């Protein structure tokens, strides 16, 4: 599908509210496998199961290993930009 830019607002006591799978070592992108109800990703409205996360706050995640992506994603705070695509 089309590449999208999506804004997510997170408070400091929360996680992103997603589960991710995949990663470079598996030959696939960082993929959203869950959107947890009522948590920031669900609330932002623009992130969905099956979306590949291409970048977060300008950090490219297309060639990142699974745990690298976890560290990068969990570091982001507040108003967080995502670049995503559903394939």
């Amino acid at each position: 599908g089309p590449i999208r830019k999506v804004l997510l607002l997170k408070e400091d006591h929360e996680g992103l509210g997603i589960s991710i799978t995949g990663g470079k070592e598996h030959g696939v992108p960082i993929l959203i496998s869950e959107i947890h109800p009522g948590q920031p990703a669900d609330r932002c409205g623009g992130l969905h199961v099956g979306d590949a996360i291409l970048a977060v706050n300008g950090v490219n995640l297309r060639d990142t290993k699974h745990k690298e992506a976890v560290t990068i994603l969990s570091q982001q705070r507040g108003e967080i930009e995502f670049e995503v695509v559903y394939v």
Partner: peptide, 10 residues
Amino acid sequence: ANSRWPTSII
């Protein structure tokens, strides 16, 4: 389902 890739809750 298959669980060959890791999943992380974040």
